[PDB]
Ligand binder design. Sequence first.
Ligand code: CU
Ligand code: CU
Ligand code: CU
Ligand code: CU
Lengths: 72, 276
Amino acid sequence: AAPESFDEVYKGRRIQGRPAGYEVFVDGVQLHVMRNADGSWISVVSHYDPVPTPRAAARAAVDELQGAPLLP
Amino acid sequence: TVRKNQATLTADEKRRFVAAVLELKRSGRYDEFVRTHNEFIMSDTDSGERTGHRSPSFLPWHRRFLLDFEQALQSVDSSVTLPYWDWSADRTVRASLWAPDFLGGTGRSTDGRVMDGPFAASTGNWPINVRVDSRTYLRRSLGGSVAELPTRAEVESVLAISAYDLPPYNSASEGFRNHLEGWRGVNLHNRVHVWVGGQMATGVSPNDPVFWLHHAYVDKLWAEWQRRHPDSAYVPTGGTPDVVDLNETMKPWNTVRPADLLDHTAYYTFDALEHH
Ligand SMILES: [Cu+2]
Ligand SMILES: [Cu+2]
Ligand SMILES: [Cu+2]
Ligand SMILES: [Cu+2]
């Protein structure tokens, strides 16, 4: 049962999430994310660091990127 | 053919290792290792096919990946072997690991850029090409995102786990492999990636040469576990969907099985490895 969608501006950047099995975007650029068996999430820019939700993974990506555009 | 503790390398060994890594980068070969690792960590999932991570083959897969890299190093300088980083011991930014004659230090405050050592972007010798964002410089934040590297006592607790792996053979598993990988328990291998930060925290973590030294010590800890537990061995041993069984071959090579990689001594020895 997928998490709810989200849309907000986090540290100046637009993060969006939606069920697909779940997609995340940072300023319109898709961010690879994955769900772990226990329900936590990671993204490709935090791939050894489980966080509880896809929004938390999106925010972690914005923290990691320090303003840099994501590459597809 | 002996893998040594990084802390024990001579100045000449450090120089030759650095030069061999930089030549693989220059020739283009290095970046394809970065790409291979990222492809696998983006595809290794708990509910589907999993080979390089979050699965029993995490250990033999990284063992063969490191052997590929070491053999590529040896094609440039046959004297070079992969050293290992015992992060239970060399656990500060002050470790000689992070000196300008070896890997360089942590990144500056502003953008995490590594400013010294042979891999600093300013040298012109370490472009980050395989990447998930626009930044093309090596980054690190040693101890930024997690305060502490594992300790020896935490390591010992993991080495004491007798079963190699357990169903469901993923990031939810009990047993040695998943505690060493770190998805459960006090967290060894994952936490080191997080502690280094920068590209080492990401799918393109081999962009940092410390990747190899971290995985060479993870690999050494598997060898140590084997000595502690001669009565335990790789599982599963056949017929397990989505997971590499003992005698099944592994991607990307397709011609090698976990069974072919259990005994490191076929390929290398350590400077020191305790008898059972
Ligand atoms: Cu992933
Ligand atoms: Cu990995
Ligand atoms: Cu790793
Ligand atoms: Cu005995």
